[PDB]
Amino acid sequence: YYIHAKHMYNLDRMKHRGLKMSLAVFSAFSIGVAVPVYAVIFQQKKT
Amino acid sequence: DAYETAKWEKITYLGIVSCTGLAIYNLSKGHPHTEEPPAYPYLHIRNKEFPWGPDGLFE
Amino acid sequence: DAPEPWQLGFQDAATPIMQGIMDLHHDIFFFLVQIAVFVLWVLSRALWCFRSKISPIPQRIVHGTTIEILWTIFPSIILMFIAIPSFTLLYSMDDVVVDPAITIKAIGHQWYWSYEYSDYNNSDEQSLAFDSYMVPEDDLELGQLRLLEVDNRVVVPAKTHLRVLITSADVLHSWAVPSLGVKCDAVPGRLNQISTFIQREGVYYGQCSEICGTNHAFMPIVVEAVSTKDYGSWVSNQI
Amino acid sequence: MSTKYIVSAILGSFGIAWVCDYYVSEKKIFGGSTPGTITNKEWGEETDKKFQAWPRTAGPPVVVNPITRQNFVVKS
Amino acid sequence: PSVVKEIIIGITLGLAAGSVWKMHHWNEQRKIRTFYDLLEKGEIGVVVD
Amino acid sequence: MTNPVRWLFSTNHKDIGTLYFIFGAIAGVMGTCFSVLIRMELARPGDQILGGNHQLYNVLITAHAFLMIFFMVMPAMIGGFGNWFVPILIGAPDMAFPRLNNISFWLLPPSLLLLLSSALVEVGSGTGWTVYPPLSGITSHSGGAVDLAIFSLHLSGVSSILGSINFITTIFNMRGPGMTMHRSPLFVWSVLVTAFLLLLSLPVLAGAITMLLTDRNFNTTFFDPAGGGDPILYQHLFWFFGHPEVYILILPGFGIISHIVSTFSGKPVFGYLGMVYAMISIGVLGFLVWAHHMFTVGLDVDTRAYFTAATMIIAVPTGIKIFSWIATMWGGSIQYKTPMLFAVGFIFLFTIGGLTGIVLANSGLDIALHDTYYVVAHFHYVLSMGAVFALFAGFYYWVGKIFGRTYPETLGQIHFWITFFGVNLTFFPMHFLGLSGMPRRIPDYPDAYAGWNALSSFGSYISVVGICCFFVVVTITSTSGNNITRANIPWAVEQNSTTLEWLVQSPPAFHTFGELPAIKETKS
Amino acid sequence: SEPPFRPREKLIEKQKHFQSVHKHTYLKGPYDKITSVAIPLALAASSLYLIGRGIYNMSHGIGK
Amino acid sequence: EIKLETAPADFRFPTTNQTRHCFTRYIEYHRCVAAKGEGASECDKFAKYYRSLCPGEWIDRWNEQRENGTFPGP
Amino acid sequence: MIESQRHSYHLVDPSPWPISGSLGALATTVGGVMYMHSFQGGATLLSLGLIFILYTMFVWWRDVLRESTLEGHHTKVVQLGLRYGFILFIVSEVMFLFAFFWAFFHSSLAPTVEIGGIWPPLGIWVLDPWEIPFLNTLILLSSGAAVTWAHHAILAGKEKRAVYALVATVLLALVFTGFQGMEYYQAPFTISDSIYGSTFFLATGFHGFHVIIGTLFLIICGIRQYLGHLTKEHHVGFEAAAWYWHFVDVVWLFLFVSIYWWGGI
Ligand code: HEA
Ligand code: HEA
Ligand SMILES: [Cu+2]
Ligand SMILES: [Mg+2]
């Protein structure tokens, strides 16, 4: 654990960090622009 | 130090004695209801029926 | 009187109320354009004359005196100047010294209006009551507007006083015709009074300004101001 | 330093917004309609000629926007 | 840098802009006044025929 | 398992701040998607993409308003920046009452789920942002959507009350040594004042919507016309909440802007006591006026006069604050980085919004301008420009700190310029239409107003481009292979800093303090 | 002056027991093992499933 | 030939609640009908006033309530 | 130890009770809607969520008691902070009941034309404001005096009579809630009546709910004082209970005066 670490995150360490953060932000955007559209799609799928 | 405890003990005992007397007074009253009022428009409204619809809760 | 494409500012006035509104907005805008241009100028000159290449020394002043009280006081007199006319407009618009000559209830139903010029009937049941429906898309002639033309418009004599009692029957609404400068809310329980006095003939258009259920903005209002003789003929013919 | 990049990106942003607008409201890549009042292309014509003389229910035709359009009848 | 000069020139520009806007407003008010004046005491009517 | 403990369980005010930031970004994207859908529907006269179902349009406007006014600015100003930078800045260890912090943040996402499910049930909540009683009555909706939305408001309100109690007790108790109240920075001060407003006003909204709920379902007559109980009662209660609600979305913005100007002008904030007292007075006079939102409903003349006077008096202190900020840039050694860009844009556009607000504050002018897009322009400049631009400024200024990396500068300036141009194009024609007279909240407009709404619709897509650029910036920051330096940024390299939070580390270690700071406190 | 109905050394024994374990706060004691890993866990699982089913039914307008 | 006149501007109600104005006029007309009855002139005056003021739906509902014996107020 | 931590504030350790309580709140809210509108899973979901909230609250207070009584993490400063937080909570509740009182007053100063322009509405048989409500006020007044007696029991070093005073107060609070229940059952008008009945019942019901929660707070403090968890110098739980009960009594006093005295006049 990293309670006793010099940096709370120490983000550099993880495995190349690039694909992980890219997917993270893209999935954040997908959840932000998928549900609002999906609500309208479902409402038209209804009556 | 303890005089305050004694004094509030005394007045709380007085309070509960008076309250018990007043409870004896209030009870033993028959409480006969008067006649139902005429059905004014603003009484007994049902905008959306209750889940336990026909009569309100506590009846 | 009617909305215009690519228009800046208010529509035309047909009520002393609307004249007051135009004048008050113009006074307010005069004071506030002065304020805005002065603030923008001071901000720009502060940013530009001290742009890291002329003054690289912070110059370290933090306590100010006899200028803080100045920008505390001068906006106060600015507000006094821009609140002198507003109060006068309010307390010269409230008073109705003259008796209203007619009375036009405007009951705001759910997605369509209704009106009753009830002060002409000898009985108790009301005569001269009708409904103000929006004209659908395909029921228009080549000229009229869209979703803003009404069957059987409101008729009103011009150059004579009025008193319209706004109220509703289903949900919140608002009687709102801008050219007359009239906007008020029809709340299902109350009977709001609006005293207005048109000054010229012609037709004036307006819309609902409150969220009614689904056909909101399809619940329009049309008021005609016509000569008194013609208004008399129309009422006698409608009875 | 970067004013080239900033201005180029602003113009590119305007271009992209224009393309999206053109596809979504001029050709409607997402289904929709257009009013019969705008596609006729002669409706505004009659709307203006009617601001000249707007029809009325009780009384002769009467004008609208008298001030802001400077259109009104004379001695009669 | 002169603070008083900057504030003075800002107030002066504000007043100039306000004067331009007020001239606009005065011309509009005169147009409305003359239109209604004529509408009562002049050739101008409002019904076409 | 250790990572799920550290995230779902940990108290750690910094980590709760990070979670708040992620939630704020998600909610912001959702709100912008709703806004783009609204603009797409309003692009041309007629039925554009909704193809009818104006009920769905009303649902869309309601959901957009709730999403961005409750789940985007508040979780980012209070939860986002507050949680992080109150205890770090004030010179204290972990916040007081950490469990309240965690429970508030984890209350928020269920509130989000309630709001979306309210937008998704049988028909929807087409009642606007301000749920008015008779439309939200059981005769006119009969769905349950309004019930779900009301419970969403309950959960959000309870979470914000818990957070407000947290912040008030932390500022009053958890300060460092020697640090008198008049040495805590203005960010701490603004968070204190906004927390007091959030503690006092929000329960009234909870009472009003509880009363609406028991009017709908349990069949009372609080807002049913037959039996007394006019809807004016609900208007009064909701807006007694509503105006303190809107002087909460901007006060943390004021604090952040003060800090940014102070750190970019090489000099601290001019007239510190003036700033503090002006902000306290804004907080106090945010309560004494609440009906300046309902001038056109039928109040008597004297109430209208009084509320006019109250709005002018609340206008004065914001003027003091803006002039103070202008003063504290007269020093010199400015440097135009992106946080300074966004602070300057904040000041300018908030000035424009405030002047429009003054125009709206009068009575007769509100009679002419009630519920027309003039009001929409007013509060979109004020709220969007002010709060969101302060948010972006704070985000850059302190992503210098949270992650430890730093954004690329040309992209930061590109994003500022794109967003400024787009969102200032798309909201000024709202002023013009409001003057023309189009009513607010309509899916179709007469043919006359079609001129500008094609132009405003051209403004939303630029802002979408800006937000996509912003997320590219966030990703390139989180994967930037070049840490914090002196050439990149000159802030954190200061061996002497006005604010305590810059001289600690790149991210704070875990307790932010191996040992608390001190104060010399001379005159022995 | 009277101690309240307990010897107060049972509390001291309990203090020794609590300060003499090497876990987090919510897992100390044998009572808390059962409690704070079985009751809230299964209870939240059931709550989550019922919440999902309820949202589904309300949205689709089924099972009135 | 038409009348072209209506209810006057009452000193008691300078606000915007002709709801109170409606109720007051209705009560005065029925106080006529009760006490005087043959004060046909003044009570036709009161009748014309509340007809001009009160909306038709309110008048009809109140008349039916008065007949039913469930009319709140005097 | 403090000498290594270098500051006396409190640093808590992770606990899933925040997230668990939030999940319980979501359960309660969806169950509430699904019972408000007729649905299959309504009643069971609402009850399950409500007991979930109760359980998480129980384990949460248990954890706080465990820390502060056995671990001893409470120092003087966090002791003060708890008082700060609870005073703020009481202020929030004051504003909530203020909103309810505003609803009543705005509905009862100028009664509408549709309830006769008079108050109370004709045909609502107002309770005599002196038979039961006066007894309820006397009961709560004696309960407040007993709470003060308990406080002066704890303070004066006499840690045995504190349980006697607390149990007397709990008995009085139970008597009060029993008489309020009797009043509800013998009510000559229900909630679905006019604005008078509606506001009366909403305000009185929330006041009674606050009475229930204050009473259970007092029961918890009584059990703690019997077990010895409280001392003359270090006791915040009892001080919170006393302040909350004084709050409830003051709200009842305002309620009695306004509603029962004025509304019946
Ligand atoms: C938070 C406040 C907020 C914000 C930001 C916005 C943003 C926008 N709003 Fe919204 N709007 C409201 C609050 C807000 N709105 C309210 C309260 C109403 C009233 C509803 C009603 O009256 O009932 C309304 C109504 C409203 C309407 C009228 C609806 C109607 O009349 O039918 C319209 C019309 O187009 C509109 C448009 C827009 C547009 C184009 C934007 C654009 O600016 C989109 C926003 C752009 C951004 C730049 C912000 C996004 C930022 C991010 C996602 C990054 C976040 C960063 C992190 C947190 C790290 N809004
Ligand atoms: C976001 C926060 C916020 C802020 C800061 C403001 C600012 C102000 N608002 Fe705003 N307002 C809203 C939120 C906000 N508003 C919202 C959400 C709505 C829509 C509600 C709805 O949907 O109904 C609204 C709408 C609204 C209305 C109309 C409501 C209706 O009729 O539709 C009114 C009118 O009373 C009003 C008043 C004011 C006033 C007087 C100010 C003033 O405080 C502005 C102060 C700012 C300054 C004036 C600029 C700085 C001052 C100077 C540089 C000094 C010089 C100025 C003077 C000479 C004093 N607001
Ligand atoms: Cu306001
Ligand atoms: Mg309105």
mmCIF file of C-alpha atoms and ligand atoms in Angstrom, chain C residues 174 185 209-210, chain F residues 132 293 296 370-371, ligand 4:
data_model
loop_
_atom_site.group_PDB
_atom_site.id
_atom_site.type_symbol
_atom_site.label_atom_id
_atom_site.label_comp_id
_atom_site.label_asym_id
_atom_site.label_seq_id
_atom_site.Cartn_x
_atom_site.Cartn_y
_atom_site.Cartn_z
ATOM 1 C CA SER C 174 -50.008 33.395 -18.660
ATOM 2 C CA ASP C 185 -50.185 34.827 -14.846
ATOM 3 C CA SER C 209 -45.309 32.422 -21.374
ATOM 4 C CA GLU C 210 -45.517 29.606 -18.786
ATOM 5 C CA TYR F 132 -44.315 23.975 -10.549
ATOM 6 C CA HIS F 293 -38.156 35.770 -10.008
ATOM 7 C CA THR F 296 -45.513 38.855 -13.152
ATOM 8 C CA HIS F 370 -40.522 37.553 -17.897
ATOM 9 C CA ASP F 371 -40.029 34.051 -19.317
HETATM 10 MG MG MG J 4 -43.654 33.359 -15.180
#
